[PDB]
Amino acid sequence: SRSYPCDEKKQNDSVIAECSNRRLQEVPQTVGKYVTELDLSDNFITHITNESFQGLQNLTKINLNHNPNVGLNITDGAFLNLKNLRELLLEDNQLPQIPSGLPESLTELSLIQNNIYNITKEGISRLINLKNLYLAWNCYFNKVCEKTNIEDGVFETLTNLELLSLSFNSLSHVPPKLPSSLRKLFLSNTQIKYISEEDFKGLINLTLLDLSGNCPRCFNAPFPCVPCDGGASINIDRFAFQNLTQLRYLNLSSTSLRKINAAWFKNMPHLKVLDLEFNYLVGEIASGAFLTMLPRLEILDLSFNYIKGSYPQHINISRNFSKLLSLRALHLRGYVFQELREDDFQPLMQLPNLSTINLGINFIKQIDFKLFQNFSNLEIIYLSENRISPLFEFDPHSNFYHFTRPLIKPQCAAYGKALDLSLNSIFFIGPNQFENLPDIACLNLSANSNAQVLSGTEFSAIPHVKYLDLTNNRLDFDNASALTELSDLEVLDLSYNSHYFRIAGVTHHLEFIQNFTNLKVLNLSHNNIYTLTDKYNLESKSLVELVFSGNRLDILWNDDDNRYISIFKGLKNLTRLDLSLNRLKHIPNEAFLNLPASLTELHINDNMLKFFNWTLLQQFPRLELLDLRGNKLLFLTDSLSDFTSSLRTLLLSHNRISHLPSGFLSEVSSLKHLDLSSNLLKTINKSALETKTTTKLSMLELHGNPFECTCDIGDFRRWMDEHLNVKIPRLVDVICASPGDQRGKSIVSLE
Amino acid sequence: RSYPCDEKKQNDSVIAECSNRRLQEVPQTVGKYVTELDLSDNFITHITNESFQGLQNLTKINLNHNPNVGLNITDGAFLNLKNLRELLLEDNQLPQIPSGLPESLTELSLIQNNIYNITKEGISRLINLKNLYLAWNCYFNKVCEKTNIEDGVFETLTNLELLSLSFNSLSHVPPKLPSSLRKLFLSNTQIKYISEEDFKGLINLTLLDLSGNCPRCFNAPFPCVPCDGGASINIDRFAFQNLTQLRYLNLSSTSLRKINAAWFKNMPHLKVLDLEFNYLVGEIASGAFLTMLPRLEILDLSFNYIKGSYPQHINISRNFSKLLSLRALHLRGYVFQELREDDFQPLMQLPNLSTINLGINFIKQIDFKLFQNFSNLEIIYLSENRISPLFEFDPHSNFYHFTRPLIKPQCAAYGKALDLSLNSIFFIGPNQFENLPDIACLNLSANSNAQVLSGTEFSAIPHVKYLDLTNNRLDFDNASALTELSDLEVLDLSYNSHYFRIAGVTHHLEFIQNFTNLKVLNLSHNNIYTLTDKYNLESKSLVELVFSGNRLDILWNDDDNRYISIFKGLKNLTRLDLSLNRLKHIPNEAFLNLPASLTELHINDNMLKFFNWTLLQQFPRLELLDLRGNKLLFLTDSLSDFTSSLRTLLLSHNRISHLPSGFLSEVSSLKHLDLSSNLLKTINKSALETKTTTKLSMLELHGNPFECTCDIGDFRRWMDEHLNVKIPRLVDVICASPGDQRGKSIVSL
Ligand SMILES: *[C@@H]1O[C@H](CO)[C@@H](O[C@@H]2O[C@H](CO)[C@@H](O[C@@H]3O[C@H](CO[C@H]4O[C@H](CO)[C@@H](O)[C@H](O)[C@@H]4O)[C@@H](O)[C@H](O[C@H]4O[C@H](CO)[C@@H](O)[C@H](O)[C@@H]4O)[C@@H]3O)[C@H](O)[C@H]2NC(C)=O)[C@H](O)[C@H]1NC(C)=O
Ligand SMILES: *[C@@H]1O[C@H](CO)[C@@H](O[C@@H]2O[C@H](CO)[C@@H](O[C@@H]3O[C@H](CO[C@H]4O[C@H](CO)[C@@H](O)[C@H](O)[C@@H]4O)[C@@H](O)[C@H](O[C@H]4O[C@H](CO)[C@@H](O)[C@H](O)[C@@H]4O)[C@@H]3O)[C@H](O)[C@H]2NC(C)=O)[C@H](O)[C@H]1NC(C)=O
Ligand SMILES: *[C@@H]1O[C@H](CO)[C@@H](O[C@@H]2O[C@H](CO)[C@@H](O[C@@H]3O[C@H](CO[C@H]4O[C@H](CO)[C@@H](O)[C@H](O)[C@@H]4O)[C@@H](O)[C@H](O[C@H]4O[C@H](CO)[C@@H](O)[C@H](O)[C@@H]4O)[C@@H]3O)[C@H](O)[C@H]2NC(C)=O)[C@H](O)[C@H]1NC(C)=O
Ligand SMILES: *[C@@H]1O[C@H](CO)[C@@H](O[C@@H]2O[C@H](CO)[C@@H](O[C@@H]3O[C@H](CO[C@H]4O[C@H](CO)[C@@H](O)[C@H](O)[C@@H]4O)[C@@H](O)[C@H](O[C@H]4O[C@H](CO)[C@@H](O)[C@H](O)[C@@H]4O)[C@@H]3O)[C@H](O)[C@H]2NC(C)=O)[C@H](O)[C@H]1NC(C)=O
Ligand SMILES: *[C@@H]1O[C@H](CO)[C@@H](O[C@@H]2O[C@H](CO)[C@@H](O[C@@H]3O[C@H](CO)[C@@H](O)[C@H](O)[C@@H]3O)[C@H](O)[C@H]2NC(C)=O)[C@H](O)[C@H]1NC(C)=O
Ligand SMILES: *[C@@H]1O[C@H](CO)[C@@H](O[C@@H]2O[C@H](CO)[C@@H](O[C@@H]3O[C@H](CO)[C@@H](O)[C@H](O)[C@@H]3O)[C@H](O)[C@H]2NC(C)=O)[C@H](O)[C@H]1NC(C)=O
Ligand SMILES: CCOCc1nc2c(N)nc3ccccc3c2n1CC(C)(C)O
Ligand SMILES: CCOCc1nc2c(N)nc3ccccc3c2n1CC(C)(C)O
Ligand SMILES: *[C@@H]1O[C@H](CO)[C@@H](O)[C@H](O)[C@H]1NC(C)=O
Ligand SMILES: *[C@@H]1O[C@H](CO)[C@@H](O)[C@H](O)[C@H]1NC(C)=O
Ligand SMILES: *[C@@H]1O[C@H](CO)[C@@H](O)[C@H](O)[C@H]1NC(C)=O
Ligand SMILES: *[C@@H]1O[C@H](CO)[C@@H](O)[C@H](O)[C@H]1NC(C)=O
Ligand SMILES: *[C@@H]1O[C@H](CO)[C@@H](O)[C@H](O)[C@H]1NC(C)=O
Ligand SMILES: *[C@@H]1O[C@H](CO)[C@@H](O)[C@H](O)[C@H]1NC(C)=O
Ligand SMILES: *[C@@H]1O[C@H](CO)[C@@H](O)[C@H](O)[C@H]1NC(C)=O
Ligand SMILES: *[C@@H]1O[C@H](CO)[C@@H](O)[C@H](O)[C@H]1NC(C)=O
Ligand SMILES: *[C@@H]1O[C@H](CO)[C@@H](O)[C@H](O)[C@H]1NC(C)=O
Ligand SMILES: *[C@@H]1O[C@H](CO)[C@@H](O)[C@H](O)[C@H]1NC(C)=O
Ligand SMILES: *[C@@H]1O[C@H](CO)[C@@H](O)[C@H](O)[C@H]1NC(C)=O
Ligand SMILES: *[C@@H]1O[C@H](CO)[C@@H](O)[C@H](O)[C@H]1NC(C)=O
């Protein structure tokens, strides 16, 4: 009664089947009859018939995206027997037509990324319960494809349709006879040059309209882009939006706009998000009558409207920006200007809820920082990727014109006001650099090629920084007072500052670490640390997590050198230590015993350990997680229970373990998760996993072992049957390497 | 075929390379004709009379690093070897010098062991010794004993030329050294004092190494023990008075604060003087000793900085003008802020001075015009400063500095070289390079340069032929970039991915077409995936393009036609590196647009599941094709249909499962075929069918999971019948199955 090939998972009172990416040649007939959702994506399935899903009474969702994985044949009426089927994902299946006889019960159908150039009544009109219909990306770029034929009135019978996406197809015109139930209409990149008055006239419920990419701005496009003749603007009739009273979202990115008709927004009192990226609106940004029409606008994106070849001294912001009373975020990337002056952002300064200013990628050379102070509620000052100095490749489910990840890492932003100056050229922080700023909590100085010696005075003007990112610089740690002016500092990321650390002959000082009363997380990764000056030990009463990966503990803990034997011992509060990627072949016993007894989580993965002393776990009574993945370990103790009472997770994947000793699991009651995958186990003896006492083992990973599928595997097979509480994932990847004829088969399948 | 060793005859020598082979004992299958034998890095734990008992022809044995994961040698184990000359026993954890070693020995190496007693019984009867290495037996924080040197132990060694006792605790120079000595290494031996009598007899001495005695310990990257109070080594006035032939003196890290000029009174041929890691800032300023060295060619004064001191200027004595033969001056780690023209006046008088090394000095500013006032200056090494817009240790290498060239020989070969790497010249202004000499070789690597090169930046040094701009942030937004360098031949733009990764900014590589002499171009690791307006790279001159570590997977995406001819315009190209481009497949049209001139094509380390072999028809000059590290499972039936120029095919680290009939005899042009690390059970006779004999030379097959049954017999016969065909490391060509033959070489059955 152990499910195969799928993995069943409890989700919200129901069981779903995860069966994706398992090299399945066809729909498995062993799917649990009670499953409500079935993910069969990324397999090699080529055929779907009315026999594929028999008996699955309560199946509401099927994902068949990407079959076969590098044409899916679906018979007429194949899904008709599934009475509860609501959502059917058929993306990236090379479909030539919409499948015939789709179930009337469908509320969601996705046919994205196929070869469908004809939307017919035979295919669609009978699907009267459809709410969401995705037909995007069937004909686009330089793909060899036909222009899309939309049968007249095909969508007319879809009276519950709320979302229609037709983006990235050749449409030429907005389809007539759209149902008035529509809430979201996606028509991006459809080669529509003209929007008439009758196009959207009857869509009184529309909350989103996407017309982006029609008459695109094609200069420097990272895709094959074809402009309207002459690079003309999209042509939107004066009355084209007169009846869209409920509109909240309007995307007009890359429509080659030079002029925004203010009348378009006359009847849109709820417009909340306006996307105007990749146009030619520098003029409109400066004057902009339309800006007076949007008192409820929360997000305005005007990025990449730069004038080709133009590098003006200043940005020109209309006084009418002051009329955007509800504005929360303003995105002004790729405007391109040399200098940000205080008077230039005047109109923005009285906006009550404006919390985000995004000025990335403007080649700004200099800024008058005191201006941000004159704002009302600024939480995020994003100035990444400028020139500031001292003193299919496109995801069809993502935004096409910008990334959607947060501007600031949420862990950093959570502390408070953020200033992102990453990817600039602040190579030196002088006495006055950070004066007249707001109370910054989150400061990003990553990749500024800063080579200075932090001395303890640089951040004095912003003394309440909690999270400081100084990664990817070339910092010279030659002063024990470095960063000490930041008394409340909790997170310090110093990753990738290896420049000076790798030079044996210069001085290196890390003693400043001990000064902080509140420092919790310190990342020293990829710094090539192998030698320190005078003080060889890291010390801190507060530090909870140290990432020391990508350094040279192999040199630090070299047998002929005693000096670094206690390097981490003074981190009394430490619970997480990452020692991965340190080229470790062995850890001296005395060095290992000098690791903080307070550790709950220890990572030594991706080294070259040929040796591990399991006995030393006796000195780590709080240790819960031990990660030894990706080493060269051959040996497993048979006495683990004598060495730990606390270990919950033991990760041993990608090692050279070929034998599981008798009584390995005996009396280790704490162990919940054992990962032995990608090792050299040929079998598992009865006595290996046997126990008399209580065991809370709930996960055992074994995939990627060269199992011997003779009768010697019978005992473990029996053990699997008697322990269904113990999940073994990727059973299709738990594979017989022998005998010659049983090769490639799952061990779960054997007479 | 030799097993397990790889035996090769080289100019009146026969060498068996048997190293790193997991050997558990000395093989009895060594060829009798073998002279030099390398058994290093195996698991041999025992050496006896029986071990080499069959081999009387051995002149050289290397047993270093055995066993890799202590080596036991019986008394007289090597004694029956009459021709044994060189014996290498390094890193074997030997507790003593092996007893009964053969008197025929001329070189013996006991480096990196546990030997703490140097005795007559072990050494004194080895009369023919020239080179004796005993270094690194007791050092740093190793648990070990003081070295005992039995009185007169070296006295019978009257042919001894080289003696190395470095990194052992000696405390004194051993007495009664043979006068035949040419080189004496005594580094890091805790010798505080040098008397007049210590080197008295050594009339033939050309090298003396006394480094690391009374060391300078501040910031040492090793366990370092200073003399009491950090005092200097104590060298008597007359200590060197008889060292007439000396060419090399190493006094690095001996805590010298003073050099006695009289040390060099009788030393007229001294050539290399090493004074690193001392406290010689004062002597560098005065330096009476500088008058005593007319034939000195190399002088290393690196890392003599005063602790905590950061002076404005370097103080060079006028006496430096007396070093008329000086060729290289090394002044790293002196530490000063500014170099003025007047500070180097004494050096400008030196007729042959060709290298100045000022690395790691934290220099802020340089008056570059000073470099014009040198006649023979060929290397100006200013790497790793602060210039801005205007066991852990190899016992066989130098301990105090790296020995590699300061500047790549390929760069320096063009002429006067200037290395400004690892500085802060983040943009080049109009006057940055004025008053420089005529530079042929320029390194600007790692300067955080983010500027848009515009065609004027290098006008003052227009004859640069090799330009290294790696590891910067260059913004290629101008089509005239670098065009002022008419004679440019090698251009390295590796690791400037900063702006290439941003889609929204413009990217311009059109400048490549403007050079008439550009031969080699390195565009590696730039993450290039989009270009502005011009999608093609063009050059009539370019011979080599390195495009590794970019995004050809995106450039050659199925839905995009724009980059289909990206390399077509490189008409002279013979070598193209497309490695690390995340390629799952290459569009047929894209591959056909690769330059027909190609002789060498690397597509290694991608993710290719497919390769159209027929497309090789359009490459008549193709000789090397590198397809290593992909996912390929399919070879073409008939390869000679598609190529006749192919000399080398590298298919290792793929998923190849069967070899089509006729493959191994198919291509008359093929010499080297690499099938190592694939998925092979056998090579069938079908594949070995021969109308005509193969020109094959090398065939790599190691790492394949061969099944070992009577069906390989047909391949074994082919192995025996073709010996012109070299198949390397047969001990790693190994049966995977069945269990009894598992782990064994296919030649064993
Ligand atoms: C023009 O501008 C308009 C308005 O901004 C853009 O419209 C957005 O389009 C994007 C991309 O299609 C939409 O983002 C996607 O939304 C899907 C629906 O999410 C809804 O429901 C889920 C849960 O049911 C909620 O969590 C969510 O808040 C919504 O209520 C998501 O399923 C998508 O996420 C999935 O895919 C992404 C990308 O692979 C993964 O990262 C996720 O993990 C997940 O698997 C995705 O978030 C967005 O909803 C649209 N906005 C609105 C308001 O509808 C246009 O994209 C833009 N035009 C172009 C061409 O750029
Ligand atoms: C220098 O080193 C530091 C310290 O390690 C790194 O910063 C940490 O980065 C890790 C990721 O590697 C962060 O851990 C992840 O954080 C996410 C936090 O999500 C928050 O909100 C969610 C709900 O949305 C909550 O569940 C959660 O409590 C948080 O409040 C999690 O989503 C992640 O969990 C997922 O992945 C991990 C494996 O990576 C699994 O363990 C989880 O089960 C789950 O699958 C994860 O926890 C961590 O928060 C960062 N710490 C800080 C202080 O920022 C730096 O990235 C590193 N610098 C460099 C350059 O590498
Ligand atoms: C104090 O200063 C003195 C004077 O400079 C230093 O003396 C040098 O010491 C180094 C390091 O031991 C010597 O370098 C080694 O020389 C060996 C001898 O090679 C000679 O003969 C070979 C032919 O076999 C010639 O090719 C060569 O030109 C020489 O004539 C080499 O065999 C060594 O190379 C081997 O090991 C290295 C490193 O692993 C590899 O790179 C090579 O591939 C090779 O396998 C090595 O180069 C040097 O000879 C000494 N100088 C002189 C003139 O004798 C002291 O080292 C220094 N003290 C300290 C402690 O630094
Ligand atoms: C950007 O890309 C460029 C161009 O590829 C790189 O520059 C080249 O780097 C390679 C090293 O990978 C250099 O090739 C090497 O040259 C050495 C010097 O050759 C001299 O001596 C040989 C024989 O004595 C002569 O044939 C030659 O004329 C020279 O006089 C060789 O010793 C090396 O040989 C090694 O490889 C070959 C097989 O390829 C073997 O036969 C050898 O046994 C040995 O293993 C090698 O050929 C090359 O010289 C460089 N070219 C230039 C113009 O500098 C840059 O490194 C790269 N930049 C970055 C950052 O990666
Ligand atoms: C400080 O600024 C730097 C530079 O902008 C920020 O680095 C960027 O961080 C983001 C978020 O982690 C990275 O994007 C992510 O990459 C991962 C792995 O590729 C991907 O899985 C995510 O979906 C996301 O795309 C981005 O690569 C990185 N940029 C660079 C050049 O390093 C950093 O986050 C900032 N730090 C703080 C505290 O905000
Ligand atoms: C310009 O300056 C840069 C920075 O100094 C030079 O880079 C350095 O190049 C040397 C020579 O290749 C590297 O040393 C070598 O490394 C290889 C690979 O690890 C090793 O096999 C060799 O034995 C040798 O140690 C060195 O790592 C590298 N330094 C850095 C920081 O990249 C560059 O060579 C200079 N260019 C020219 C043309 O002189
Ligand atoms: C050859 C270097 O010896 C030690 C050293 N390390 C550093 C360092 N990490 N940074 C420095 C920054 C400015 C000036 C001097 C130094 C410096 N220095 C020089 C000095 C100030 C004399 O210690
Ligand atoms: C969002 C930018 O779009 C195009 C662009 N690319 C670059 C570039 N690679 N570098 C620049 C350097 C200085 C000033 C402007 C630019 C620039 N610019 C701006 C402009 C001068 C208008 O082309
Ligand atoms: C479908 O769901 C019902 C509960 O609504 C459940 O009783 C029934 O067993 C399920 N059918 C199958 C075949 O599992
Ligand atoms: C500002 O935001 C708050 C909620 O965060 C909202 O209640 C208020 O109406 C907003 N003010 C304006 C001017 O829209
Ligand atoms: C660190 O730098 C400050 C400011 O330059 C200086 O006052 C202090 O002496 C330095 N601390 C040291 C040398 O450890
Ligand atoms: C140790 O870490 C815990 C959890 O982060 C924290 O509450 C405590 O303040 C730390 N101890 C000290 C002494 O800072
Ligand atoms: C493991 O550690 C213990 C010290 O607790 C030591 O006695 C034992 O020798 C170690 N095992 C090995 C083989 O290093
Ligand atoms: C060395 O090898 C001999 C066998 O020739 C053995 O008898 C002796 O015990 C070994 N000595 C040591 C200490 O290993
Ligand atoms: C040593 O040198 C002096 C000359 O400086 C000479 O008188 C004496 O004979 C020499 N001794 C030897 C051993 O040659
Ligand atoms: C300088 O080197 C040249 C060889 O190019 C040589 O003729 C001359 O003797 C050298 N001069 C001195 C003073 O060593
Ligand atoms: C140039 O070098 C000569 C020695 O050849 C020296 O006498 C003179 O002072 C130098 N001139 C300058 C301007 O440094
Ligand atoms: C490149 O830069 C130079 C100097 O600014 C300028 O004159 C020229 O117009 C530029 N070339 C272009 C934009 O192609
Ligand atoms: C082709 O390359 C070689 C250099 O390897 C050169 O001799 C020849 O001039 C090049 N062809 C042209 C047109 O530059
Ligand atoms: C290989 O390329 C040739 C074009 O010359 C084409 O005819 C053939 O179909 C291609 N083979 C494959 C499998 O793509």
XYZ file of C-alpha atoms in Angstrom, chain A residues 104 391 455 613 630 638:
6
model
C -18.409 20.958 -19.899
C 30.827 62.414 -1.555
C 37.663 52.081 10.837
C 34.599 10.649 13.926
C 28.830 15.496 -1.142
C 27.015 1.108 14.268
